[PDB]
Design a protein around this ligand. Structure first.
Ligand SMILES: CCCCCc1cc(O)c2c(c1)OC(C)(C)[C@@H]1CCC(C)=C[C@@H]21
Lengths: 136, 136
């Protein structure tokens, strides 16, 4: 026999304007981002978009001077393009009704949606890369 | 708005008779179980029960000379009682259709159901506490 595990989450779909950003320079250096691109995009506060259809997600992230697009299904292994352009395979999971959690290359990524504010925290050792964006 | 995330797993419900057990003493020593209780329950091969109703689990596990009962919902943070009686808060996740995975106090716990055979693997550093039970 089989069991049905049905979940319900807040809609992550929407366009989000980057407002706050912590430890950008430190984090990009740890992952090996060139200093040229670090200073070029450290002050860029762009707009990211999420498209959620059930457990499927489409991410369009404006990070610094780069636009990185990725797609995944919750609970299924996916190939994600990192900030450094390297492609890693990982699984994204839903915690509660508003947290998207994944871990790749010693980076613990947590994306929590609180109302119109979405917070993406990425921890690499002592570095806590925290981004705060608002739905527009 | 809200989104629906539909998952399906094998039914974990049933009573399971412990058959094989490796590194009981080493694991219980690592978590600080008193040596009196370690020798007392190292050879006990009891029966554990799982009650799964969708994404909610009720499991009564016979570990050594202790009967520990806990309840949780997959993806939601819950409070679990450990072997040492300490209560920890963690999140249990479903991997595939037959794996229940969680991590607490540097202990990676994996419970995999392959047909009528259930395998409980708990890794704490170098110690791999492996329990193999059969549904009865
Ligand atoms: C259904 C899986 C969710 C996690 C359940 C989970 C939690 C837990 O309290 C225990 C579980 C596994 O299995 C045994 C082998 C009895 C453990 C022995 C040593 C420790 C620290 C605690 C025991």
């Amino acid at each position: 026999g089989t069991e049905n595990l049905y979940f319900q989450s807040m809609s992550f779909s929407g366009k989000y304007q980057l407002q706050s950003q912590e430890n950008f320079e430190a984090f990009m250096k740890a992952i090996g981002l060139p200093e040229e691109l670090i200073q070029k995009g450290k002050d860029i506060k762009g707009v990211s978009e999420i498209v959620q259809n059930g457990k499927h997600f489409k991410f369009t992230i404006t990070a610094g001077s780069k636009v990185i697009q990725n797609e995944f299904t919750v609970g299924e292994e996916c190939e994600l393009e990192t900030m450094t352009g390297e492609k890693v395979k990982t699984v994204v999971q839903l915690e509660g009704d508003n947290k998207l959690v994944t871990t790749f290359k010693n980076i613990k990524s947590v994306t929590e949606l609180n109302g119109d504010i979405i917070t993406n925290t990425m921890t690499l050792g002592d570095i806590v890369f925290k981004r705060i964006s608002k739905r527009i």
